[model samples]
Target: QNFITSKHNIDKIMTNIRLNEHDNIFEIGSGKGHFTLELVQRCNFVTAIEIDHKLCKTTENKLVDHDNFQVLNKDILQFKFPKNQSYKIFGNIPYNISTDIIRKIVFDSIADEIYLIVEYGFAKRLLNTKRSLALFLMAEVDISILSMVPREYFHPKPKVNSSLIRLNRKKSRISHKDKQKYNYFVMKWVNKEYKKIFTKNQFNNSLKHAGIDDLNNISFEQFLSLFNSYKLFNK
Candidate 1:
């Protein structure tokens, strides 16, 4: 009843994710069977991963009659996806590891469309003004966030509100290049000095490793300018 009170009014949000005949859905943290059941109706097949063993069994039993649904009791971060298969991912995740889990989904190429029902603050971070790491990396992935849900909606009412976000992965403008490696490089640079400009040494190291040069004493904005200028890459 707690989950229901908190998120039962999710049909509208689900509708907005735009499920279709082509979509194969994967849901993380299926706390009960409520959201999983909804997903089962629209997807070709739905693989719902739940960390709690009891809930997983319950969900599996609840979904026993549905051929389209499969429930796995497993930790998401360590779970392995089948090779060469792609899915559209969705989750009503615990706030703690939402970003990390989303990163895994995208970077590992396990999913195409990502629909997230998360805390409002985390959502803002994902769509941060400067654009958080995930946003910057998944920029080509179309994103649409629905209106926020009030605290009154949840039982024991969470301290913060919640919202839904939809993400559709774009065809890589740089498909031929190593996009993951590029993301890694950029993140390394940004992580080291998120607020400051890259030092001459840092700039030289990155440029040299990327096999490019002529950039000197550049600000982070300049780095972005040059990075964006590359024909093979884009946000």
Candidate 2:
């Protein structure tokens, strides 16, 4: 039997939308606009972009009653945001593109928060404790789960489980005082085959190697500042 996400779970996702209404939302994979309608009900304006022309047509009709909602038929990977158009993002992303899109937004610096409905497995990766590549590069961003949408939520139920994850993007830029050294440090310490390393030590080493140097000297808030200097976005 396929996992079936309940309507209550879906409602919880909407609740998160209500709490973060200040964000301009862009939903990828806006199939039939079910969640799109819910987001529009609570937000300023939502640009729901979908890849399928037919699906976009159907969603257009579905959301025609709401002027605040604009449904665009476009592939998210290739779609370009209008010049100077900045917005917070929300999407039930395709599993294949989840990791890449996360990287895109992490560096985009435009979106302030991300509301994501994705496979449960990937959620674990984003919040991984120590030595997580994404976490190391994006420690500034905070993650929390809004609710679980079981695989059965879809018409043709998925074999795997899915959940809603909220990533609040931090405002400050990451510092990259010494690029090569910082790269070597993360690779040597975090990615190294040292059966294990103290979590605090690892964090400290990363700071030192990245040229932040003073572990106790710097405030927790300064980590983002250090990260902004490094061009992790190039990777």
Candidate 3:
């Protein structure tokens, strides 16, 4: 329900990220174009996608002078990601659809880097790996907390703090062709179908080797290790 309104906060982000002059930037929830203004100057092309028609006009007006910028009125979730070249994604995400956005980017898109501003609690929770989706995501990319943003920086005061998070798709333990199988296995395990698929010993052995007891809090390495252990046995 809130958008980042502080020029100072935007400046802080512009400085922290490594921007290439020819990099193409893909954005979501382009709320008023403050972030896009800084991005367009540094990158070669910036495609800002907004769900609201009124907000799209605002962003377009803000970046009207820039030839490198384009503001599109569209649903980013339904839009396919740019796949022809390496690209970066940055967005001011609403808390309501933050997880869904992340899921879309991870499963349906291929991007070089991802930077999103989301609820602080969500960022911290993603880091510790509560949801199995995070476990699934960590297998393909690396996630980290970039910075903490205060509620004071928003127009309509939000209920809680927010933070910036980064995802780099530099790791590829699971290939594209293997994604479905990987996802399917995780679905079963996360659904607590351990009894249906694996014997008690088979399940326990994988967990033991992966150093996983709770299965709730585990590292990306542990998740992959656990996944490979069972996947190899069954295959």
Candidate closest to the true structure, highest TM-score:
3
The predicted structure with the larger TM-score, 2 or 3, is 3
Candidate 3: deviation at residue 174, Å?
A: 2.3
TM-score, every prediction: 0.72, 0.71, 0.90
Give the lDDT of residue 84 in candidate 2.
71
For candidate 1, lDDT tens digit of each residue in 165-215? 887788654444646644654665445552243456645554665555543
Clashes of each: 0, 15, 0
Task: Report the Cα lDDT for candidate 3.
Answer: 0.82
Q: Which ten residues in a row have the lowest lDDT in candidate 1?
A: 226-235
Model 2, residue 234: distance off in Å is 22
Candidate 3 is scored at a TM of: 0.90
Question: Candidates' lDDT values, in order?
Answer: 0.67, 0.64, 0.82
Q: How close is candidate 1 to the true structure, as a TM-score?
A: 0.72
Residues 1-235 of candidate 3: C-alpha lDDT, one tens digit per residue: 5776677877876766776789998898788888888889889999898999998898888887899988888898898876678888888899889989998887678887899888898998777654677777787679988888888887698888888889988667887776887877777766777776578888889889989888766777787787788678877
Best by lDDT: 3
Ranking by TM-score: 3, 1, 2
lDDT of 1: 0.67
Q: Please say which candidate is ahead in lDDT: 1 or 3.
A: 3
